[PDB]
Amino acid sequence: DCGLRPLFEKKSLEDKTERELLESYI
Amino acid sequence: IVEGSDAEIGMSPWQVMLFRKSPQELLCGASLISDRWVLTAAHCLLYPPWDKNFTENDLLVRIGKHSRTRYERNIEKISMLEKIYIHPRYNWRENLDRDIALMKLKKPVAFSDYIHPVCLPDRETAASLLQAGYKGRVTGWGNLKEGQPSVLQVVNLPIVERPVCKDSTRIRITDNMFCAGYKPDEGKRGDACEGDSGGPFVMKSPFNNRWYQMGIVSWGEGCDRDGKYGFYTHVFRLKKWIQKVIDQFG
Amino acid sequence: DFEEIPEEYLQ
Ligand SMILES: Cc1ccnc(CNC(=O)Cn2c(C)c[nH+]c(NCC(F)(F)c3cccc[nH+]3)c2=O)c1F
């Protein structure tokens, strides 16, 4: 269950800057 | 953290605070990798040049925190240490090579909305995500400038090409470390700072949406200086040691 | 400027 946050991934909510990370994995 | 921003509640449930009993003070950051184990930088516990040599009974681990100085009643959990394991080849004499240490808690910590372990990378994950240009995230209660934040700070930094890391310092860089941060002409800034040591450098896998700890805040020359970069312990490179300690001592 | 943590932990 590691790496899945209760208040985010588990509820399908994103934190305010994680998109910046994914956007860099081109 | 320099040039970062306040973290959202529950944003880094694996973030751990290394707290000194007396005088009560923040020592370093750390991360939760299981209900019983914590990962941090060895220099947080041992560094002869500054007469630093802490034992299990000298520190406390505080998990689930957001506020730096407040005792977050009913939210954070404080735990004692049963044992500390430092890499036998940690090089404190020269360049902090293999700057890593494991800490076994006396009792398992119960998970909650604010306490949750981060994943350790497998060969495949490390291979695909640890690439120059790719961004990771650093968190900590360290200084805001080379004063102290009210709550946990966060900053996203790109991994930098090894040649550039090498050419920015006089220190001998090894395969057990990588550096990160923006280049002077990229416009954006950000870096870890005093107090942030031992903290986690994490990345989110676009394959399974899980967060993985790729590095440990290790060292730097100043904080957020142009032409300089922060260095991190390469977690995967030392996973063989991590696995050995875990299945051999509990 | 750290807030007093419970003695039950400092024991
Ligand atoms: C990534 C990062 C950026 C800024 N500050 C820190 C805080 N980390 C430390 O203070 C650890 N740390 C220690 C123990 C000793 N000397 C440090 N820097 C000075 C140095 F770069 F010349 C150096 C590096 C390794 C061994 C001896 N001298 C250092 O950075 C960071 F971990």
Task: Check whether residue B216 and residue B130 sit in a common domain.
Answer: yes
Contact partners, residue B78, CB within 8 Å, separation at least 6: B19, B60, B61, B62, B63, C5, C6, C9
- Pick the closest to residue B31 from B61, B70, B73 (CA basis): B61
Give me B56's structure tokens: 């299990």
Using alpha carbons, list the distances in angstroms from residue B236 to B44, B121, B175, C4, C9.
20, 6, 11, 38, 34
Scanning the structure block, which residue is given the tokens 């967060």? B211
Give me B195's structure tokens: 């107090």
A17, A20, A22, best to mutate vs chain B, most B CBs in 10 Å = A17
Task: Check whether residue B161 and residue B82 sit in a common domain.
Answer: no
Residue B134 DSSP symbol: -
Q: Say if CB B14 and CB B118 are below 8 A apart.
A: yes
Q: Is B197 a catalytic residue?
A: yes
Rounded CA-CA distance B162/A22 in Å is 22
The residue annotated as part of the active site, out of B99, B191, B196, B224, is: B99
Give me B187's structure tokens: 């416009």
Task: Check whether residue B19 and residue B79 sit in a common domain.
Answer: yes
- The sign of the dihedral angle between the CA atoms of B89, B93, B95, B96 is positive
Give me A1's structure tokens: 């269950």
Task: Check whether residue B101 and residue B38 sit in a common domain.
Answer: yes
Q: Is B34 a catalytic residue?
A: no
- Interchain pair A25, B209: CB under 8 A: no
Q: How many CB atoms lie within 10 A of CB A22?
A: 15
User: To 5 degrees, how large is the angle CA B121–CA B95–CA B245?
Assistant: 40
Radius of gyration of chain C (CA): 7
Phi-psi region of B187 (alpha: psi -120 to 50; beta: other; left: phi over 0): left
Task: Check whether residue B164 and residue B109 sit in a common domain.
Answer: no
Q: Where are the beta strands (DSSP E) in chain B?
A: 5-6, 15-20, 25-32, 37-40, 46-47, 52-53, 59-63, 77-79, 81-86, 101-105, 135-140, 153-158, 177-180, 200-204, 211-219, 230-234
Task: Check whether residue B90 and residue B163 sit in a common domain.
Answer: no
Task: For B20-78, give the DSSP string.
Answer: ETTTTEEEEEEEE-SSSEEEE-GGGTEEGGGTEE--GGGEEEEES--BSSS--TTT-EE
Indicate which CATH number applies to the domain containing B29.
Answer: 2.40.10.10
Task: Give the total number of structural domains in chain B.
Answer: 2
Q: Which helix (H) or strand (E) holds B124?
A: helix B123-129
Domain residues for B21? 13-117+237-248
Task: Check whether residue B126 and residue B30 sit in a common domain.
Answer: no
The residue annotated as part of the active site, out of B168, B197, B218, B224, is: B197
Task: Check whether residue B122 and residue B232 sit in a common domain.
Answer: yes
Rounded CA-CA distance B99/B176 in Å is 9
| First-to-final CA distance of chain B | 34
Residue B151 DSSP symbol: B
Rounded CA-CA distance B47/B57 in Å is 17
- Interchain pair B10, A6: CB under 8 A: yes
Task: Check whether residue B69 and residue B4 sit in a common domain.
Answer: no
Q: How was this structure determined?
A: X-ray
Q: How many CB atoms lie within 10 A of CB B68?
A: 20
Rounded CA-CA distance B238/B176 in Å is 7
Q: This structure's resolution (angstroms)?
A: 2.0
Q: Say if CB B100 and CB B216 are below 8 A apart.
A: yes
Residue A1 DSSP symbol: -
